[PDB]
Amino acid sequence: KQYIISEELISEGKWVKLEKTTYMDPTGKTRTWESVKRTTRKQTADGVAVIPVLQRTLHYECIVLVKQFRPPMGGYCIEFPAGLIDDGETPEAAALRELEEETGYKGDIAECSPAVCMDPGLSNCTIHIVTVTINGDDAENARPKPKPGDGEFVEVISLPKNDLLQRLDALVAEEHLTVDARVYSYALALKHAN
Amino acid sequence: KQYIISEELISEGKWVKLEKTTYMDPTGKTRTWESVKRTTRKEQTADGVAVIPVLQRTLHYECIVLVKQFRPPMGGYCIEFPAGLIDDGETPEAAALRELEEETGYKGDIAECSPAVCMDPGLSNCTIHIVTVTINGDDAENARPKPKPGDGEFVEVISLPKNDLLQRLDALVAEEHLTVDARVYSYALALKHA
């Protein structure tokens, strides 16, 4: 019933662009919407977010998270390991690559989501949420070495799965950090499931 | 270690603006970052709220109440948590309860409210409070929930069981052409993994 009529370019940067989307509402009236987009997409989605489950025997299962300075936020944020998918790359391969680059861990694919939207009121940005198990007992994951690219500066924070929300709340309280919405939504559901 | 140096405007629309952010990296080098921001924010702790509405009913499995909406940036329909911006002077809990009633028709009760969490921190400064709300479906006020949508709002309600959320979300994705929200998918994945 609703559909895109046309798109006007307001201001295109190098990486980000701002468009004025004109769309048909379900009654019949025409309405406008300043939509946001990325220029880097070719591709199933823009990027991937890795839910990395660190499994070590006789230890609590941990979720591997990344702390980075984020200039749009103007501060540090706790997030799932993540990054854009390169040209000629399946979402599963981008997940294992980004996981190793940012954390140093070599993981195995458990499952992969379809394209899911990030902030659909604001932007068109999508990701594949990729669940990855990491064998922490394997010798390749004994001394994990992050391989950061030019510009990335990532700090690894592994928190136990069984108390993820409470440990995230503790980090917000004593270090002024902004936890990611998807990380928080995941941590909430872990507690709510019971 | 890392901090904001300056923020110069590239373009400002009625609702969204694009800024050229300059920041210091941890090696001591100056770098730039195109950052997206909303013009509607002012004194609020976050831009908006996302409602995780747990519909509770005697001799019913708990349901998560979701909303289906055409989203002009995505160019199609999206399945999301009920959500909207926080009005000036409005507390996050009141915004959550109002938006839930407007989009679904349900009168909820506050369970818990998250701190400000980032929506897409590589792209924008946008934040929300994730407000968990219980809905007493046995109450007479929640018997015939009538959505009260504002100007330009056209919301359909989709209530799915909590114990089978991910599979029911996948079943909707296979049947029709629509995108599931990343926070909703993250929530459903956690319910599986717990």
Ligand SMILES: Cc1n[nH]c(C)c1-c1ccccc1N
């Ligand atoms: C979403 C949303 N919530 N509140 C407003 C004013 C918007 C908006 C409207 C058109 C284009 C971009 C926006 N960010």
Ligand SMILES: Cc1n[nH]c(C)c1-c1ccccc1N
């Ligand atoms: C995020 C991200 N992934 N890849 C690039 C080039 C960006 C980016 C960098 C600075 C400002 C805006 C952006 N979208």
Ligand SMILES: [Cl-]
């Ligand atoms: Cl798993």
Ligand SMILES: [Mg+2]
């Ligand atoms: Mg990254």
Ligand SMILES: [Mg+2]
């Ligand atoms: Mg990387």
Ligand SMILES: [Mg+2]
């Ligand atoms: Mg809304």
Ligand SMILES: [Mg+2]
């Ligand atoms: Mg609304």
